[PDB]
Each structure stands twice: as C-alpha cells, then as structure tokens.
Amino acid sequence: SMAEDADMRNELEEMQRRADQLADESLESTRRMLQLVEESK
C-alpha cells in the first residue's frame, strides 16, 4: 500500500534571457540619431 508513481504534471513554457539592458542600449542610440537629424535642418 504505497501511493504509486505519478505522471509529471506537464511543461509550462517560460523563457527569459538578456533583453532588458540590451534593448535599453539599443534605444539610447536611436534617440541620439533623432537628435542629430533634428539639428541638421
């Protein structure tokens, strides 16, 4: 009388890597491009 094994509930897909600061950096460059393009006119 030993509770038999149980099937692994399932998989809950969840993926997180290095986006935060990589895209914040990406942004800081576009802003400066915009400023320069504005300045030229």
Binding site: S1, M2, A3, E4, D5
Partner: protein
C-alpha cells in the same frame, strides 16, 4: 550543576559523563597515542515531561558544538514512495560536506531524535511477512555506520518504549550507552521550585509566608512541566485577583502590586487547574460515591478493618510486594462504593481507577491495550492501588453459551502475577458479583483472599437505615416498625434508595401504604 537550567539529576550525569566523554577532555596527544575513537551514540528513556530535551540541549551546548537540528519522528513518515529516505538523508549532508572540506580538522555536530520508537521495529523474519516500514530502518542503519566513515557526529535518541527498538540498532557499534530518568524526589522538586522562583526572590515578588520547603511535600509525584504550569497559573490568578480587587477601591497601586506575594494564589492554582497525570484524582469519587457511607450495620466496620489491614500489610512487607483481594456480594449491595472508600483511605500517592464505562464499543484488542497502558503507568511509581471494577462486564459473560472474550481473561490472569521492579510495591483490588462463575474459570485461585459483603438481614436494621436517611417521621416510623416487626427482610441499599424515592412521589397521605405494598412485592427471602 545548578548553575545551568537543569538541576536535580546527578547520579544520572556522572555515568553519562564518564562512559561517553572521558576522551573528550583528556589532552589530544595521549588520545592519539593510544588511538581510540569516541562514542557514537547514547539513548535516554523515561516518562514524558521529566526534563529530557533540556538535558539533550545542555549536553550539546557544553561541548562547544554547533546548533542542534530538531527532528520529529512522526513528521518523517510520508505516503509517497522514496520520500522518507530523502528526509532522513537530508540531516547528514552538512556534516558530510564539512568533513570532506575540512578533512579530520572538523568540529562536532548533534542530532536530536524524538519518538524514535515509531521508525524502528523488529523487521519480519519470515518471507512475505516483512514490516511495512523496513525501508526507513534499513536507511537509518546504513547511514549511522556504513561503508563510508564519519568521525565528527554524535547521535542522541529519545523515546518512551525501550522494548520495541530493533535489537540490531543497540549493539556496541551504535548507541552503546543508555540512561533513565525517574520521577524527581522531594529534594528535586524543591530544587526545581527554587530555580524557577529565583526570579521572584531576586525581584522581591515572594512573601515570607510562602515556604517552598513546606510546599515541596504538597507535591508528591509532580513533574517539572507541571511545576512550570503551576507557577504560571498561580501568577495569572494573582494578576486577575489583583486587577479585580485593586479596582474595587481607590487605593494606591503599590499596595496591591506587592499583594501578589500571597500564599492564597499558590493554593488556588494547586486546587484550581493543575490536574497531574501521575497523581491521585479527586473528581471521580463524586461519581463513584454519591452519598458517603452510612453505618447501617456491623459488616461495614469489619470490611474497613480488613481493608486497613491489607493496606498495612502491603506497605510494611518485604517478601510479598504484591497483594490481591476480591470483593463479592449479592447484586445491588454497594461494592464499588466500599472499594473506592478503601482506596481513598489507603493514602497512597498514585490511585488510578479502571472501569468498563470508558470502553463502550471498544474492540477486545483496544481493551487489552488500555489495561496494559494503565498497568504500565502504575508501575512507574513507588506505590499504587489499582481497582478493577465488575470484571464480569469486561469479559462480556452471558448465560447463554456461555460466551466470553478469551484474550481479556488471559491478560487479566497473566497480569495478576507479574511483579514490579525491585523496591516498588503494588496493590490490586477487584470487585465482582458472581463468584461461582469466576471459580469455574479457575481464577479464584489466582487471588490471595476473599471478603464477603452481605445485605440487610433484619427489620431493625432497616429501621436504623431509615432513621439515618431521615425521610419519615416518628408516627410513620412506628407504624412501619410494627408492620415489619418480623425479621424477614431482604433488600439492597441502592434498591431501598430507589424505592424510597418512588414512594416520595405519591400523595402525602397515601404514602405508607404505597411503600409497604412495594416492599412486600419485592423479594423478601434469599
């Protein structure tokens, strides 16, 4: 020893220090010169709430060891397969890792097992008859001492059933020492009281009329936990009485504040909500005796004299530390009341009463377990007096058949001869109503003596009983006396009580005739 929390047990500490820690204080050079390993375990057994966890903690904190890891036996068990072993193993990972990291320069660890008797039992020998919890025992045995070596650990175990532990787990390789803690004597109780009242004494919250030395005797078979409960309850009651009285009048708070030193508080806590689990009980007599004893005749005096003689014989004998006595008589003769009165007059420390009322619907095995538990508890004292009631109702005897439960009879027969350990005396009083049947099963020869309690035998005795009860007046008294002048009376006292109660319900004028007719209807001859 009193400098620390625990106090009262010294003969049980000298041995534990010597045979387990002699090598832990000698200079290391000589120890390595001889080359002897330290002890690996010890075992402690005794009644619950007798100062075990405190000693286990102190023995650790005195060795400059790390924090103990408290584990409870029941919590280890689980229904899923393969979790109990993981739980058991989880308690050794830190020690293993530290030993591996630091080689042989590590410190000392500790483990505090509680109720170890529930995860260790004699493993089944027959094929297909193995125990349902053998995996846990196997895992523990392997871990305690296996192929791999551990030399920086110390295992302490606790339990209350030192007979169900697997034999293989007590060989000199694992848990090679044992100790026992009994009920503290008067001196130990006094020491505990003074330790716990040191605070009050220092802060001047104790009175001069409260004498701890005198109060020590008032506690005959108390326990440390019960002492801490008594003190706390007394303080709480003192606070309640203070707030209630001090708010009565506009008197300075300081006068009432110091008033908490009254001895009233302690006596009230004593007789208030302090109900020892190993002491005489006082609230059961009211149920088992409702109207005291009335001396309607001589036999009461003789029975009481015989009871006192038996008590004295058991208290002042050395070759017969076991004494039994059997009470018998006609139905409704009042045996239980006399048994309870004798027990109360015994003046013994431990007086436990066992009755069939508290086993309604119990299976026979449950009744056997209850009997064994009661006897085991009664063994743990220097004196006792057990009272087996009825007997004929424990067995379930019924005239048809006959039928009865064999196992209960066997348990009773076996237990009526087992002797307690050396120096501890015991007394058993049994009450039945059918002595011939008991003689038939060959039980009357197990007891040591018999006593006879008769019923009312003559009319004048009934008149005396009526006079003592005081329910009828002189006119009706004389009327009944002349009506029942002949000595042909045969009635039980309890039946007489019920008959009088019923007769009282009739109309005031038509009572004597009712009572006389009822008495005549009832049996009047043996």
């Amino acid at each position: 020893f009193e400098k620390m929390g625990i106090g009262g047990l010294d003969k049980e500490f000298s041995d534990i220090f010597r045979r387990a820690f002699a090598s832990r204080v000698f200079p290391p050079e000589i120890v390595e010169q001889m080359g002897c390993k330290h002890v690996k375990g010890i075992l402690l057994y005794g009644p619950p709430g007798c100062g075990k966890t405190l000693l286990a903690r102190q023995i650790g904190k005195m060795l400059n060891a790390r924090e103990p890891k408290v584990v409870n036996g029941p919590e280890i068990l689980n229904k899923y397969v393969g979790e109990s072993e993981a739980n058991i193993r989880k308690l050794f990972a830190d020690a293993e890792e530290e030993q591996r990291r630091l080689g042989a320069n590590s410190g000392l660890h500790i483990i505090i097992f509680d109720e170890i008797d529930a995860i260790c039992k004699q493993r089944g020998s027959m094929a297909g008859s193995t125990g349902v919890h053998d995996t846990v025992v196997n895992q523990l045995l392997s871990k305690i001492d296996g192929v791999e070596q551990l030399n920086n650990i110390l295992v302490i175990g606790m339990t209350n059933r030192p007979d169900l532990i697997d034999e293989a787990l007590l060989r000199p390789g694992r848990l090679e020492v044992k100790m026992e803690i009994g009920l503290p004597d008067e001196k130990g109780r006094l020491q505990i009281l003074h330790i716990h009242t040191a605070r009050m004494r220092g802060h001047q919250l104790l009175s001069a009329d409260v004498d701890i030395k005198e109060l020590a005797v008032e506690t005959k078979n108390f326990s440390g936990a019960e002492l801490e409960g008594l003190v706390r309850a007394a303080q709480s009651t003192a606070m309640n009485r203070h707030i209630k009285a001090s708010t009565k009048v506009e008197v300075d708070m300081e006068k009432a504040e110091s008033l908490q030193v009254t001895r009233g508080d302690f006596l009230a806590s004593l007789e208030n909500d302090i109900k020892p689990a190993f002491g005489t009980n006082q609230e059961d007599y009211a149920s088992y005796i409702m109207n005291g004893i009335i001396k309607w005749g001589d036999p009461v005096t003789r029975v009481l004299d015989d009871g006192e003689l038996l008590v004295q014989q058991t208290k002042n004998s050395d070759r017969t530390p076991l004494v039994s006595v059997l009470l018998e008589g006609p139905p409704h003769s009042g045996k239980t009341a006399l048994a309870a009165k004798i027990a109360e007059e015994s003046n013994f420390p431990f007086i436990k009463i066992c009755s069939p009322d508290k086993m309604i619907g119990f299976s026979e095995t449950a009744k056997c377990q209850a009997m064994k538990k009661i006897f085991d508890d009664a063994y743990k004292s220097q004196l006792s007096c057990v009272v087996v009631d009825d007997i004929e109702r424990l067995l379930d005897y019924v005239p048809i058949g006959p039928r009865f439960s064999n196992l209960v009879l066997q348990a009773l027969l076996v237990l009526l001869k087992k002797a307690p350990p050396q120096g501890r005396k015991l007394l058993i009083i049994g009450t039945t109503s059918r002595k011939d049947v008991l003689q038939e099963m060959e039980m009357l020869n197990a007891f040591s003596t018999t006593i006879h309690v008769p019923n009312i035998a003559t009319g004048e005795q009934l008149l005396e009983a009526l006079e003592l009860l005081g329910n009828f007046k002189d006119k009706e008294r004389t009327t009944i006396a002349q009506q029942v002048k002949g000595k042909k009376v045969w009635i039980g006292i309890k039946k007489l009580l019920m008959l009088i109660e019923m007769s009282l319900q009739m109309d005031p004028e038509y009572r004597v005739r009712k009572f006389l007719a009822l008495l005549r209807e009832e049996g009047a001859s043996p």
